[PDB]
Amino acid sequence: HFQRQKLMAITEYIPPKPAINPRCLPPPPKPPKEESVRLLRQDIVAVFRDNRMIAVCQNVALSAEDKLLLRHQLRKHKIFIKVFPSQVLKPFLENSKYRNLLPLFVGHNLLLVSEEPKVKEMVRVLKSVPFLPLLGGCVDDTILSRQGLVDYAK
């Protein structure tokens, strides 16, 4: 019947309207941050604290197997290829000995971590791959250029 249909239309549910849409909302507060990733903090903290001077060089499209071979090669140089995912590298400065080394660790780059000032061994590592660019060496955890690294190394 038509008359019954009229009753249904009037009884139709009416939804309320929010004052502001979620996208156009005023700035709301956000939950406090949580460190999930926490394991990786310990590994990077140990290696950087152990090694005062770090030579930062961009990583060419190297193979995983070569890195182990290069890791053994550095053992002859008394240096260690210890690397981890870099998306946890940036928060390293947030929770570590220093907070100001973020600009040095920009992008994906090979890190040569050595605790001793064996300049010749570090220079030899540079000689291994010329095409691979060495960003620089933070001798005594002080920011420096590649040319400066050699100058201070002298």
Residue ranges in contact with ligand FES by CB under 6 A: 23-24
**Do the Cβ atoms of 55 and 81 come closer than 8 Å?**
no
Residue whose structure tokens are 């946890």: 88
Out of 61, 76, 127, 154, point to the residue binding another protein (CB under 8 A): 61
Output 102 or 132, the one with its CB closest to another protein.
Answer: 132
| Minimum gap (Å) between residue 22 Cβ and ligand FES | 8
Q: Considering the rule CB under 8 A, would residue 24 count as an interface residue with another protein?
A: yes
| Minimum gap (Å) between residue 123 Cβ and ligand FES | 57
Q: Considering the rule CB under 8 A, would residue 117 count as an interface residue with another protein?
A: no
145 binds, among ligand FES, another protein, none (CB under 5 to 8 A by kind): another protein
Interface stretch with another protein, choices 44-52, 88-96, 116-124, 140-148 (CB under 8 A)? 140-148
Q: Which residues pair with 110 in a beta bridge?
A: 57
Output 113 or 138, the one with its CB closest to another protein.
Answer: 138
